[PDB]
Amino acid sequence: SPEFDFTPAELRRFDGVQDPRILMAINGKVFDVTKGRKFYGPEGPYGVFAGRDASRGLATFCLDKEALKDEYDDLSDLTAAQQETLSDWESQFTFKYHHVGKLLKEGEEPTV
Amino acid sequence: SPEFDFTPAELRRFDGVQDPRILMAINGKVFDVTKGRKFYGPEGPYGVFAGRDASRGLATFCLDKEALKDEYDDLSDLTAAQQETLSDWESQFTFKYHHVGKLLKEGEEPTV
Ligand code: HEM
Ligand code: HEM
C-alpha cells in the first residue's frame, strides 16, 4: 500500500469500462495503467488483463482469456523460467506505470 | 500433399532433437521450419511448437505448453478473431517456409 491494496474481486471493476480507470496486477503489485488504454482498453490487444491479475498470462505468454483465474491465483506452479519472465514484466511496469498497492493473496491482510 | 501428409502422432518426432528436421503445422498445413531452429529448436523461444500442431497456440497467442493438445485439435471453438489471427500466421509461414503437406484431421485420408 503506497495508496491502496485490492483483492482480485475488488480489482475487477477497474477495467476502463465499468470505471474509466484501468488497474492491473503483476506479481502481487497493482498498477494504474489507465494511460496505457491503447493496450488495455476494451478494443486494445491486451484488454483481457484490464482489472485482472495479469501475472500468469504475462509469465506464460498467454492471452487466452479462459486461462485467467477468477479469484486468487496461486503462482506456485510456474516454472523457474516463467517466474523470471514474470519478474522482467514487473520491472517494466514498475518503470512505466504508477504503483498503487498490493494485490492481496488469499487471507493476506491489507496495509495502512 | 505437395510431398507428404502427417497425422499429429507422426509429426511429433520432427522436433529438431529426435530428428534434425523440424516440422510444424499451422491451420492444417505442415511446414519445414528446420531453417528457423533459432526459434523452434530446444533452446528457442518457440520450441514448444516443434513437431506439433501450433494452430491453437498461434491463434490464441499462447506459448503455455499445457495448452497444446496431444492428438487431434478440433479448432471449431476458436473465436472469429482467433481464426483471423491463425490465417495471418498461415500466410507468413507460407511466405517464409517450405509447405510439406497436410496435417491430417481425425479420420481424414492422405493424398498421393
Ligand atoms: C507475435 C507476438 C507479439 C508481438 C510481435 C508483440 C509486440 C509488441 C510490441 C511491438 C510492443 C510495444 C508496443 C508499443 O510500444 O507501441 C508490445 C508491448 C506489450 N506486449 Fe506484446 N507482442 C506480442 C505478443 C504479446 C503477448 C502474448 C503478450 C502477453 C501475454 C504481450 C504483452 C505485451 C504487454 C503487456 C506490452 C506492454 C504495453 C505497455 O507498454 O504497457 N504481447 N508487444
Ligand atoms: C512480448 C511478447 C512478444 C514479442 C515482443 C515478440 C516479438 C517477436 C519478434 C521481434 C519476432 C521476429 C524475430 C526475428 O525476426 O528475429 C517474433 C517472431 C515470432 N514470434 Fe514472437 N513475440 C512475442 C510473443 C510471441 C508469442 C506469444 C508467440 C506465439 C504464441 C510468438 C510467436 C512468434 C512466431 C511464430 C515468430 C516467427 C519466427 C519465424 O520467423 O518463424 N511470439 N516475435
Numbering used by the authors:
A (entry chain A), B (entry chain A): 68 to 179
Sentences from the paper on this structure:
We solved the crystal structure of the haem-bound PGRMC1 cytosolic domain (a.a.72–195) at 1.95 Å resolution. In the presence of haem, PGRMC1 forms a dimeric structure largely through hydrophobic interactions between the haem moieties of two monomers (a stereo-structural image is shown in Supplementary Fig 4). While the overall fold of PGRMC1 is similar to that of canonical cytochrome b5, their haem irons are coordinated differently. In cytochrome b5, the haem iron is six-coordinated by two axial histidine residues. These histidines are missing in PGRMC1, and the haem iron is five-coordinated by Tyr113 (Y113) alone. A homologous helix that holds haem in cytochrome b5 is longer, shifts away from haem, and does not form a coordinate bond in PGRMC1. Consequently, the five-coordinated haem of PGRMC1 has an open surface that allows its dimerization through hydrophobic haem–haem stacking. Our structural data revealed that Tyr164 and a few other residues such as Tyr107 and Lys163 are in fact hydrogen-bonded to haem propionates. In the PGRMC1 crystal, two different types of crystal contacts (chain A–A″ and A–B) were observed in addition to the haem-mediated dimer (chain A–A′). It should be noted that a disulfide bond between two Cys129 residues is observed in the crystal of PGRMC1, while Cys129 is not conserved among the MAPR family proteins. Since PGRMC1 dimerization involves the open surface of haem on the opposite side of the axial Tyr113, no space for CO binding is available in the dimeric structure.
PGRMC1 is a member of the membrane-associated progesterone receptor (MAPR) family with a cytochrome b5-like haem-binding region, and is known to be highly expressed in various types of cancers1011121314151617. PGRMC1 is anchored to the cell membrane through the N-terminal transmembrane helix and interacts with epidermal growth factor receptor (EGFR)18 and cytochromes P450. Here we show that PGRMC1 exhibits a unique haem-dependent dimerization. The dimer binds to EGFR and cytochromes P450 to enhance tumour cell proliferation and chemoresistance.
